[PDB]
Amino acid sequence: DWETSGLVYLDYIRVIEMLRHIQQVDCSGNDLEQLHIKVTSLCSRIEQIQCYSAKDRLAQSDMAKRVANLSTPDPQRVPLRLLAPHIGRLPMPEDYAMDELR
Amino acid sequence: RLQYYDKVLRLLDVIGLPELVIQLATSAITEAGDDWKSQATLRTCIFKHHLDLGHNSQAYEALTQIPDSSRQLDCLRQLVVVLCERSQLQDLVEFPYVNLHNEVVGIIESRARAVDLMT
């Protein structure tokens, strides 16, 4: 039943290996959408059950961003300016391209 | 009249010319009365001539067309590298938006893999 975190962790390494080996492919990998959905559901713990995870959230963000340089990955970002301009000018970078470009 | 035009374009590109070779490649691509499966040799030569010359913004049309028919991403990557090295930062960013999304993503992924950082 509950088998999403391990599947996402296994798909992240395979996606990273495929991106490091093949740099011209840019199609859907069937299970890529499911892995992205699982990573998003695991990272949205603070919105689902209000979890204050740090190392797990960082690992999930790293696994979601390591495969974004080959496929598409439309989501996977941060959380607006509600935590960046009210905590210490530091709230996990994400869409630096969209922030510094148009 | 296609083989002679291709040979003339290759001889002009191997010498040092750029406009004459591009014109010969365009003429050979326009006059293609064979309609065979070996039409990729002229398209690759035209793409190479457009990447070596540039000037106008018509070089992005052949790269997005040669990569959408088959899996010839090497020519598109070489053209993108030539356009980036030919000092065209304000022109190659706007020409890539008019192409496909998958080809642009592939070109970005191929260009981001750089293990040598210079000036």
B71 has a chain A CB within 8 A of its CB: yes
Lookup: tokens for B50 = 């457009």
Cα–Cα distance measured from residue B48 to residue B109, given in angstroms and rounded to the nearest whole number? 21
Contacts of A27 (CB under 8 A, 6+ apart): B102
Q: What angle do CA A77, A80, A82 make, to 5 degrees?
A: 135
Lookup: tokens for A89 = 């000018």
Which residues does a gap of C–N over 2.5 Å follow in chain B? none
Task: Check B102 against A24: CB less than 8 A apart.
Answer: no
Contacts of B107 (CB under 8 A, 6+ apart): B76, B77, B80, B96
Structure resolution in Å?
A: 35.0
Cα–Cα distance measured from residue B46 to residue B28, given in angstroms and rounded to the nearest whole number? 9
Question: The tokens 């148009």 sit on which residue?
Answer: A102
Contacts of A65 (CB under 8 A, 6+ apart): A73, A76, A94
Q: How was this structure determined?
A: cryo-EM
Given its phi and psi angles, is residue B100 left (phi above 0), alpha (psi -120 to 50 degrees) or beta? beta
B10 has a chain A CB within 8 A of its CB: no
Cβ contact B54:B92 at 8 Å: no
Q: At what angle do helices B40-53 and B19-30 cross, to 10 degrees?
A: 150
Cβ contact B61:B83 at 8 Å: no
B110 has a chain A CB within 8 A of its CB: yes
Contacts of B80 (CB under 8 A, 6+ apart): B63, B92, B107, B110, B111
Cβ contact A35:B116 at 8 Å: no
Q: Which of A15, A19, A20, A24 to mutate to test the interface with B (most CBs of B within 10 A)?
A: A24
Contacts of B100 (CB under 8 A, 6+ apart): B64, B68
Cβ contact A4:A42 at 8 Å: yes
The sign of the dihedral angle between the CA atoms of B106, B109, B115, B119 is positive
Residue B95: is it exposed, middle or buried by C-beta count within 10 angstroms (0-12/13-18/19+)?
middle
Radius of gyration of the CA atoms of chain A, in A:
15
B78 has a chain A CB within 8 A of its CB: no
Task: Check A23 against B102: CB less than 8 A apart.
Answer: no
Choose among A79, A59, A49: nearest CA to A8: A59
